[PDB]
XYZ file of C-alpha atoms in Angstrom:
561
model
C 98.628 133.118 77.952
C 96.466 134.798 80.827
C 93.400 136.066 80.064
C 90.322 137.496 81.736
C 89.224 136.530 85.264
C 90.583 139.975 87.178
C 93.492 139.093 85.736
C 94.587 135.702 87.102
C 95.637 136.310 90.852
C 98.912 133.715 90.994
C 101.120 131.960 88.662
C 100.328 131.023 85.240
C 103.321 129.233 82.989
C 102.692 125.399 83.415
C 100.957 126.243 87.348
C 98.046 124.605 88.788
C 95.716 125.346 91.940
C 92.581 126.950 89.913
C 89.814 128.224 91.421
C 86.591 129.535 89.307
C 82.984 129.983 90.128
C 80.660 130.781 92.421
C 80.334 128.723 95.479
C 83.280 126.916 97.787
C 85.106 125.542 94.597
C 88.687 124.638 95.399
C 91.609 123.808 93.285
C 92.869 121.719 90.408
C 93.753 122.217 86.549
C 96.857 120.860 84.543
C 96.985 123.500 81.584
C 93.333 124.544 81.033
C 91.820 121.256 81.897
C 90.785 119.574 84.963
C 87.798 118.961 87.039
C 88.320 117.987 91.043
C 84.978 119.831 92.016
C 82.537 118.435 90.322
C 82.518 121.190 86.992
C 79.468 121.221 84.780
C 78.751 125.088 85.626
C 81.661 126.724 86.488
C 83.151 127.916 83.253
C 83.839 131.655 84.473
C 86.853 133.291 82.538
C 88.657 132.050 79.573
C 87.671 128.647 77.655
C 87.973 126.452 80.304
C 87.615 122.526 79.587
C 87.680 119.512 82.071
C 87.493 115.607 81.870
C 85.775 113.689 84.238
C 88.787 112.452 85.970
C 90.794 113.954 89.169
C 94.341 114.074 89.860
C 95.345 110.510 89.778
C 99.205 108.911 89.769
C 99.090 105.801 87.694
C 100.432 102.526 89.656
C 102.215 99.691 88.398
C 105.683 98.461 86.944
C 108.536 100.988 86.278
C 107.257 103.128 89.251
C 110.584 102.041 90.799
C 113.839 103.267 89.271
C 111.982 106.504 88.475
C 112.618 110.306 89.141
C 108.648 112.309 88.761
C 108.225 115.795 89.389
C 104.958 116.771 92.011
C 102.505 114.884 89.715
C 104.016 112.455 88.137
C 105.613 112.965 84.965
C 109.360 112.054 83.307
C 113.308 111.891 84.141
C 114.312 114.717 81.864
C 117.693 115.542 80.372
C 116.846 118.931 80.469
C 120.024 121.950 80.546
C 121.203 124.221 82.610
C 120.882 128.185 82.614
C 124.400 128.890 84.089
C 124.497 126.054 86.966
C 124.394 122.645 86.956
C 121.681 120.109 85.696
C 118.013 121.000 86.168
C 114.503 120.099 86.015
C 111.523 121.663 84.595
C 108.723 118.752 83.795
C 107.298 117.179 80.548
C 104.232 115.993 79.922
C 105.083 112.521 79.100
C 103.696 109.117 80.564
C 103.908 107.560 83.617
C 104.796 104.136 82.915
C 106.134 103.039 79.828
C 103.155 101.657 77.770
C 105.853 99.741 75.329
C 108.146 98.266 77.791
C 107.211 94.333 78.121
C 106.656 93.495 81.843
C 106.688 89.398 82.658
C 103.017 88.472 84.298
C 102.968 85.543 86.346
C 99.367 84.792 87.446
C 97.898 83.592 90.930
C 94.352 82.648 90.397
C 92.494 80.723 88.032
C 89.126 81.375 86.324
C 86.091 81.148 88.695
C 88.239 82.344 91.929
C 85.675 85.027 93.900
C 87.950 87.935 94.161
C 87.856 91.051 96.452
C 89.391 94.792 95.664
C 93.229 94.092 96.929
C 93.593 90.465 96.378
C 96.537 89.690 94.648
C 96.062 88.199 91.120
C 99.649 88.493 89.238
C 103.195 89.048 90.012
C 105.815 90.915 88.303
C 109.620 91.170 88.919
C 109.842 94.328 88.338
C 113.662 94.517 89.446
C 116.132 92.280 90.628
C 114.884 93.406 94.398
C 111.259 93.981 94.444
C 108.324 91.158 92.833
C 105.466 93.875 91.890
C 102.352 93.217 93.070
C 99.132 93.278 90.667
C 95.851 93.687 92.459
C 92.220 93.973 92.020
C 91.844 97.893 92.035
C 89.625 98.685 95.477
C 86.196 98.870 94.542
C 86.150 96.038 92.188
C 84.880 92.050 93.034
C 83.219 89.803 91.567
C 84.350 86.288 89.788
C 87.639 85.951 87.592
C 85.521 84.816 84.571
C 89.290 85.889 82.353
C 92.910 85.325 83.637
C 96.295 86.109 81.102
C 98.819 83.422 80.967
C 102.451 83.081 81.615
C 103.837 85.372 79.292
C 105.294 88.783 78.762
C 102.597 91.684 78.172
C 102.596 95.342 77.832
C 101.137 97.733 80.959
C 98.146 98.773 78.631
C 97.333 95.280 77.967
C 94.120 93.447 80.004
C 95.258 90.803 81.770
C 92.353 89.562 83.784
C 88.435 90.126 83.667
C 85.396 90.122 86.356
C 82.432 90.157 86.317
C 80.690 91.733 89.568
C 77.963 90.891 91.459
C 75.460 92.707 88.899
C 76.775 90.776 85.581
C 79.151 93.989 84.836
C 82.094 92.936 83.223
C 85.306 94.857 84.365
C 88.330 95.226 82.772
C 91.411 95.046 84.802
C 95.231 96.015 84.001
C 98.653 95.681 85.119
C 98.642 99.353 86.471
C 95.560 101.830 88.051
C 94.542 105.147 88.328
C 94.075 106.452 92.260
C 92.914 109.964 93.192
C 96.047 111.368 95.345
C 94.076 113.711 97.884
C 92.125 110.231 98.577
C 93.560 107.268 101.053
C 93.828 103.971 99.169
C 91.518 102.562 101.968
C 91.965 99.438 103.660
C 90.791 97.400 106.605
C 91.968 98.567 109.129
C 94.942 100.729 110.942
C 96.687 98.858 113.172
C 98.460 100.788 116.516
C 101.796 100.885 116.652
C 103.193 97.669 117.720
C 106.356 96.797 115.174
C 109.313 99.747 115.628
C 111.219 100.771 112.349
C 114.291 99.128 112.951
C 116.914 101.286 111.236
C 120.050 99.583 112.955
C 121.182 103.180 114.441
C 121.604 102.866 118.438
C 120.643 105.828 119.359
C 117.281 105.807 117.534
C 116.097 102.317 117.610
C 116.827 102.835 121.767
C 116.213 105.652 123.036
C 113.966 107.826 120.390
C 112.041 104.325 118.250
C 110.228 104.780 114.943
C 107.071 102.778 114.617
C 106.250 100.990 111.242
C 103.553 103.223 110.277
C 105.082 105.906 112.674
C 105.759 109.883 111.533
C 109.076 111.257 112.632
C 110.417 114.878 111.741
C 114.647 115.723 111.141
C 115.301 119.387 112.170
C 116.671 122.272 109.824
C 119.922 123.831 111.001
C 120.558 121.816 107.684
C 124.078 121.127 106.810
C 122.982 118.416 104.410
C 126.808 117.232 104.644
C 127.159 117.744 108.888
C 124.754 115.162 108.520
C 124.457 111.803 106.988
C 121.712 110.077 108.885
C 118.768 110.771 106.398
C 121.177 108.292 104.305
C 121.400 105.953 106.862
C 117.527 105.810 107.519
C 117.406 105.377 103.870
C 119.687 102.489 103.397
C 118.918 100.721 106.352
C 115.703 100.726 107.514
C 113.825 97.500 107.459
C 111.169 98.937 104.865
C 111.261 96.968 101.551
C 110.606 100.045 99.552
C 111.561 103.894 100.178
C 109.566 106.985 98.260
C 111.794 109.727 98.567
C 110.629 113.791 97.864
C 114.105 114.625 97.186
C 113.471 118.069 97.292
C 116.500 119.420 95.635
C 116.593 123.135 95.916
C 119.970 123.206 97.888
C 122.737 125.049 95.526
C 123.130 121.568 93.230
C 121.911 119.234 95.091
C 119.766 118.255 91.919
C 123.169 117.776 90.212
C 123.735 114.768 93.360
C 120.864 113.573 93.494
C 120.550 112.876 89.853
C 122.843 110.234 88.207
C 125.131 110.121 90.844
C 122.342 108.169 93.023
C 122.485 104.888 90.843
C 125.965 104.205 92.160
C 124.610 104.608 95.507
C 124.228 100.574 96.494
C 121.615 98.320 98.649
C 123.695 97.143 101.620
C 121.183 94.227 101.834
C 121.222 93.104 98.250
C 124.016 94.254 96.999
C 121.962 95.511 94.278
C 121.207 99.405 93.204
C 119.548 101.295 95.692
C 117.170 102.826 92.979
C 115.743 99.350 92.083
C 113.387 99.750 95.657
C 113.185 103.349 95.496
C 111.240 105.778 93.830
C 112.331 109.911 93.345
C 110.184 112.720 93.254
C 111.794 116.120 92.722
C 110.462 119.631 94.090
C 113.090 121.825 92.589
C 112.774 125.907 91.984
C 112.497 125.614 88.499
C 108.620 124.049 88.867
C 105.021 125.226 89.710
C 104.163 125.879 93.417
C 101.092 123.503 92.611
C 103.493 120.588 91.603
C 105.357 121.238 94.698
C 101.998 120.916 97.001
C 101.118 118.065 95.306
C 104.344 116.129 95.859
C 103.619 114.899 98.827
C 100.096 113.404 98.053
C 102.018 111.882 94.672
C 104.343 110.450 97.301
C 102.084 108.789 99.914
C 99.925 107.593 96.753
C 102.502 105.546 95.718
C 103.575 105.042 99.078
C 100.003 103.449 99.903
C 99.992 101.869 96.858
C 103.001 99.577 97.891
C 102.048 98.646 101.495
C 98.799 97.394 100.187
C 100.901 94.872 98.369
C 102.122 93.883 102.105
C 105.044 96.502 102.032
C 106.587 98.290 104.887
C 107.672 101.796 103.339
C 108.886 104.576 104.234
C 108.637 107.916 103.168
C 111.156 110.527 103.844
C 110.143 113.901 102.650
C 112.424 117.234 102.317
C 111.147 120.813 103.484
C 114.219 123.001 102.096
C 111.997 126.214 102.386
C 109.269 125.022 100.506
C 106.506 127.575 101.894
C 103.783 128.264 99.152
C 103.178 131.494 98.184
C 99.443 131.404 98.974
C 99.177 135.325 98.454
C 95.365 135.257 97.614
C 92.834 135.891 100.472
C 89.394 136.834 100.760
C 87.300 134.206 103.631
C 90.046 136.659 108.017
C 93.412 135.047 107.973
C 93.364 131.143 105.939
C 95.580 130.116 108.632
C 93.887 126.520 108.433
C 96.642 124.824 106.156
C 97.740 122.625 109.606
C 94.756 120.836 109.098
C 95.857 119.666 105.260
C 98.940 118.979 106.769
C 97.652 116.472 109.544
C 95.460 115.037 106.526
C 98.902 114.353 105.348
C 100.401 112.584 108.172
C 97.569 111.115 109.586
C 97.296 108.860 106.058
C 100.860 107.212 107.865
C 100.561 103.779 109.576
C 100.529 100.350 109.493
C 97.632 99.038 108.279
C 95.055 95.376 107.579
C 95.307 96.109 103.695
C 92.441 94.792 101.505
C 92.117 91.300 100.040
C 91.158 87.904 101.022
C 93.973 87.092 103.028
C 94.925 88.548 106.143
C 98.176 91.109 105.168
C 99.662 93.479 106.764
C 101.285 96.577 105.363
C 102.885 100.153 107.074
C 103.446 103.794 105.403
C 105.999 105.312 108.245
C 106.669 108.888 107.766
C 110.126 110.483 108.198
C 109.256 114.259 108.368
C 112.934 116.109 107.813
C 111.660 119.557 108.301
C 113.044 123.271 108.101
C 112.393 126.513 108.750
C 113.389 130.169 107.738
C 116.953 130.432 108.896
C 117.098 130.124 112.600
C 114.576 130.168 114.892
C 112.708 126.779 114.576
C 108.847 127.817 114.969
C 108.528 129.950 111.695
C 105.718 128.055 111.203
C 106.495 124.939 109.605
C 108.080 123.013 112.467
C 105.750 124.952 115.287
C 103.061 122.811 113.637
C 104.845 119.516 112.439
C 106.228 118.710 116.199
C 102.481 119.089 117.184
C 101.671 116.526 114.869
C 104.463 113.419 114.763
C 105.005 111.400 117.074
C 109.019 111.092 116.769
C 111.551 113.668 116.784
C 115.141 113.432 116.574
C 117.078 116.866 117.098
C 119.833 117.474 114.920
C 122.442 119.264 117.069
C 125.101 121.716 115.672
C 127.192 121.902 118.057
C 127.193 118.183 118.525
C 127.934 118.030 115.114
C 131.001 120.413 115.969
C 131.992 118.035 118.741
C 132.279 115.227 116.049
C 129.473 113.207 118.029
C 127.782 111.279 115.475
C 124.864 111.004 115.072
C 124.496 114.470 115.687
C 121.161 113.460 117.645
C 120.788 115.482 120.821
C 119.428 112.611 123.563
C 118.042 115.525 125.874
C 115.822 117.120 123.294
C 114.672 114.371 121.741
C 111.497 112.040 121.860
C 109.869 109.426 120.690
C 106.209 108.569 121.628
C 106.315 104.880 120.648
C 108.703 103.481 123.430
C 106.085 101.772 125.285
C 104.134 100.602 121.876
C 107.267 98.796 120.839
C 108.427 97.931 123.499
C 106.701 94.448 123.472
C 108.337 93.160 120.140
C 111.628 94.064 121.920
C 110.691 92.416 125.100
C 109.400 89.195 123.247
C 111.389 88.931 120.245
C 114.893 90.425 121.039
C 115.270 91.144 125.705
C 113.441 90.504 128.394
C 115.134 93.751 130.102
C 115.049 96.277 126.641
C 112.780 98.922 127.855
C 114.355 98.975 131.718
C 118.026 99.260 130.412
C 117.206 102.638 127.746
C 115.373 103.810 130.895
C 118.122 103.175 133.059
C 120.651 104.811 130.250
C 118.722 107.580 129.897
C 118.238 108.454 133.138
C 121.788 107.764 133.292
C 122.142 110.437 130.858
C 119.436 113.262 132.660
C 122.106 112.860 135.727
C 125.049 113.982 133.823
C 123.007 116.917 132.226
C 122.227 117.690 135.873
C 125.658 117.408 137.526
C 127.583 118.864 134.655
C 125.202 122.370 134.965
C 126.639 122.612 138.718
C 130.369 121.606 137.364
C 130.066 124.169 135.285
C 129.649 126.779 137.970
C 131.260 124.782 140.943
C 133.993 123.463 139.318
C 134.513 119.833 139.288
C 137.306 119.533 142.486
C 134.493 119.457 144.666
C 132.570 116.154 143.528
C 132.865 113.233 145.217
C 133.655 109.677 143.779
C 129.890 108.946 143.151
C 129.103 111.673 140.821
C 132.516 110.891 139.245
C 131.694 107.125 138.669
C 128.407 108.763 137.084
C 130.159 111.078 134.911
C 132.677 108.256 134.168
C 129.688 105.909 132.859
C 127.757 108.319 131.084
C 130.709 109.284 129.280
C 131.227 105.773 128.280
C 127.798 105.474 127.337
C 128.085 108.750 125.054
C 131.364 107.658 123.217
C 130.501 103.647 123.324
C 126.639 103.427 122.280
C 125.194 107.145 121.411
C 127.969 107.505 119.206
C 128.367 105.381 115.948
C 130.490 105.401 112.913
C 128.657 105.540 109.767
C 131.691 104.876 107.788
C 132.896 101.866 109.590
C 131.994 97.972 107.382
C 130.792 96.748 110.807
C 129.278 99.509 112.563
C 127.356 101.133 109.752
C 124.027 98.698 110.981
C 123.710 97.848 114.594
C 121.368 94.716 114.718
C 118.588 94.766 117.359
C 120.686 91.787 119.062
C 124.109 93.627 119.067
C 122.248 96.945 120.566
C 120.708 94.748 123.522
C 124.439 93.665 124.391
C 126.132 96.236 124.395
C 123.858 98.136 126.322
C 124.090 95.215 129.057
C 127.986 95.666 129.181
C 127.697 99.105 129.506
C 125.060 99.061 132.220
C 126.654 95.880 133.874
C 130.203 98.136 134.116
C 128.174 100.273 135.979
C 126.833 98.111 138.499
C 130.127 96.654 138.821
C 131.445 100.457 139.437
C 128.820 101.973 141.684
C 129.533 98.241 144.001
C 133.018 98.984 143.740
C 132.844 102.743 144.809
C 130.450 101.639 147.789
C 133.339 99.127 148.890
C 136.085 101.891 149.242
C 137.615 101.321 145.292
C 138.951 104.526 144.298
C 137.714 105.128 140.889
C 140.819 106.291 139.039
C 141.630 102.638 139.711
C 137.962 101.473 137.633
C 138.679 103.775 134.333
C 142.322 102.117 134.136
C 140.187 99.037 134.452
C 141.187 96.575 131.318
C 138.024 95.945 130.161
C 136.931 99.468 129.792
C 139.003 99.881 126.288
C 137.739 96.863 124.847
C 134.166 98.342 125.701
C 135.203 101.361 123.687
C 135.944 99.066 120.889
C 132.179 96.730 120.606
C 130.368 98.251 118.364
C 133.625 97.382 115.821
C 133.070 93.751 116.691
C 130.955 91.617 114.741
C 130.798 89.001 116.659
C 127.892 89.344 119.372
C 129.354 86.279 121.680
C 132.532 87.885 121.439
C 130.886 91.340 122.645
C 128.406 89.304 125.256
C 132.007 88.018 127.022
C 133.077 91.089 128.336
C 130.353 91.117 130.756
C 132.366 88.045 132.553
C 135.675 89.853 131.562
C 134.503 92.776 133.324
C 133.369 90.612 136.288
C 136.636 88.974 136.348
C 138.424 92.168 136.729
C 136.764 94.020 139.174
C 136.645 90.508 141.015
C 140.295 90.885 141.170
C 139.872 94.437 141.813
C 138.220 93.942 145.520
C 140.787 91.075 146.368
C 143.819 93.840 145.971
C 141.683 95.681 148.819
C 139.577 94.315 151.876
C 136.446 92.348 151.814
């Protein structure tokens, strides 16, 4: 199947990444055929043909509920060789051309229409209405609108005619060139945070809507479960996930044992707001490469309908093999991969009306092994703005999340902080200061334990140690598993942070009026503080900073005054 060309320096099988000619010509070709740098003259080698187009993705109804390899392509049956179920790629569709999708239309004939304004919807599941818009690039008058009625993807549902009398023909799906950013407006900074109802995130280490975040590799896909928990309950309508399988058989779990998995909000499938691309061993390094613009594509393609998303992507060792080089060292591919990220954020999307849409990014890298700079993550933590550190040994510890609060950062605490000010407390941003420096102490004074043993410290840095604790077993930590604490509401967080921080007030008062302190952790109060974040009820949580009162109240009357 290869033929001449110096004999064809990488992969050929069902590969892409082509590069013939003569001057700076880069890359693209399905089989034989494709043209992403301008062809007519570069026809070097074996019978090489091209259509006009580049490498789009197809957008419209039944992108949801759908597994695609790196380009876009089926949900195969497929076999397996002496594993479990794999994945190869067919060249199918897309989008079903014969599947009947319902239109309901939002303009009439002789509306002035804009690239982005919303003409039709479709309920494309029993979650998400899709969203049919004027392609960008297109305006004009509506001079022919469909009716209320069911209609095929293929079939032309509305017509305008542009400024110059061109009459253009518009569908329930489009064609967009990943590699290109569906444009829009304008990128808004980061203002909203990415509430994912995790404490110790939505505090201390925020994700912006239209943020980029990154998930370390000392993997143990199943010591951790919080990539599920971003998934499920982060307040983006729809999720693109690159479930990069290549894991042992993780393909096997992340096939048809997903559509089980169940929408905590809806009650609904999961899979009805979510769309799957796979990047498995058993396909092209090309359609691995490509994954990712495939994924913000579609990813773009939603917020423009006024969608937050978010995209979580999976490294797994997924270094291309890149062994051909001629023009020192091509050491440039950070830049492709800031290209990448920088197409994240919330965004003015196009159209008449003022919407607002996000892309936020959820990196979830790896590296070789051990040793996290080898490069992949070096260059990643150069480039988001969020990282939460994945922590073996907290993981051993059974604190979950696993999230290490002293290696750790976020860069959007004082972007969000604002919306949390405003919308949820007045005191939001001083209290996760106050906990975290909280937190820096104990790092401090349990270094010098360590060596000095802990005899010698007197009640103060106990109290300290006493509170921290309390703040690492009643708010860092959360239980996944638990009906009520799964989701931590912005409200609930706010609370029990101010019973926590409220205890210690109370404590560090009571140590400076002669209280002994084993007295304060027999304190009452202090087990039902342990117990919060299994309440429900936020009033019921907001009482035991009274209760607490109360107690240490009677706590100063059993000594002097």
């Amino acid at each position: 199947d290869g033929m001449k060309g110096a004999k064809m320096y990488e992969v050929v099988r069902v590969g892409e990444l082509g590069l013939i000619g003569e001057i700076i010509r880069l890359e693209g070709d399905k089989a034989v055929i494709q043209v992403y740098e301008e062809t007519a003259g570069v026809r070097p080698g074996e019978p090489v043909v091209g259509t006009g187009a580049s490498l789009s993705v197809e957008l419209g109804p039944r992108l949801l509920t759908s597994i695609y390899d790196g380009i876009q392509r089926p949900l195969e049956v497929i076999r397996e060789k002496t594993g479990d179920f794999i994945a190869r790629g067919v060249t199918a569709p897309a989008l079903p051309r014969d599947k009947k999708w319902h239109f309901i239309p939002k303009a009439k004939v002789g509306d002035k229409v804009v690239g982005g304004d919303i003409i039709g919807e479709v309920p494309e599941t029993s979650i998400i209405v899709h969203k049919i818009m004027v392609p960008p690039g297109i305006e004009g008058e509506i001079v022919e609108i469909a009716e209320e009625g069911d209609y095929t993807i293929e079939e032309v549902i509305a017509k305008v005619k542009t400024p110059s009398g061109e009459i253009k023909e518009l569908k329930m799906y489009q064609r967009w060139p990943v590699r290109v950013k569906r444009p829009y407006k304008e990128k808004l900074p980061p203002e909203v945070p990415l509430i994912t109802g995790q404490r110790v995130i939505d505090t201390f280490f925020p994700q912006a809507k239209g943020g980029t975040a990154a998930i370390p590799g000392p993997f143990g896909s199943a010591k951790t479960v919080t990539q599920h928990q971003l998934a499920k309950w982060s307040d983006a309508q729809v999720v693109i996930y690159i479930g990069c399988g290549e894991r042992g058989n993780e393909m096997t779990d992340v096939l048809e044992e997903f559509p089980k998995l169940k929408d905590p909000k809806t009650g609904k499938p999961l899979m009805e707001r979510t769309v799957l691309i796979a990047n498995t061993s058993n396909m092209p390094v090309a359609a691995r490469e490509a994954s990712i613009y495939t994924g913000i594509t579609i990813a773009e393609y939603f917020r423009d309908m006024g969608y937050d998303v978010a995209l979580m992507a999976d490294s797994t060792s997924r270094w291309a093999e890149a062994l051909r080089e001629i023009s020192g060292y091509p050491a440039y591919l950070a830049s492709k991969l800031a290209e990448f990220y920088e197409r994240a954020g919330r965004v003015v999307t196009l159209g008449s009306d003022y919407r607002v849409g996000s892309v936020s990014v959820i990196g979830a890298v790896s590296p070789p092994g051990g040793d996290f700079s080898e490069p992949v993550v070096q260059n990643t933590l150069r480039v988001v703005k969020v990282f939460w550190a994945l922590d073996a040994d907290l993981a051993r510890r059974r604190h979950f999340p696993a999230i290490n609060w002293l290696t750790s950062y976020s860069l959007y605490v004082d972007a969000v902080k604002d919306w949390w000010h405003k919308n949820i407390d007045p005191e939001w941003k001083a209290m996760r200061d106050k906990a975290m420096a909280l937190l820096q102490k104990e790092s401090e004074l349990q270094e010098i334990v360590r060596i000095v043993g802990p005899d010698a410290l007197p009640e103060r840095e106990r109290a300290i140690l006493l509170v921290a604790r309390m703040l690492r077993e009643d708010y860092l930590q959360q239980d996944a598993f638990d009906e009520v604490d799964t989701y931590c509401p912005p409200e609930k967080q706010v609370t029990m942070m101010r019973v926590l921080l409220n205890f210690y007030d109370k404590t560090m008062e009571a140590i400076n009026r002669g209280v002994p302190l084993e007295e304060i952790a027999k304190l009452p109060v202090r087990e039902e503080i342990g117990r919060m974040k299994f309440e429900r009820d936020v009033s019921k949580i907001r009482s035991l900073i009274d209760k607490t009162n109360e107690q240490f109240e009677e706590l100063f009357k059993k000594y002097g005054a």
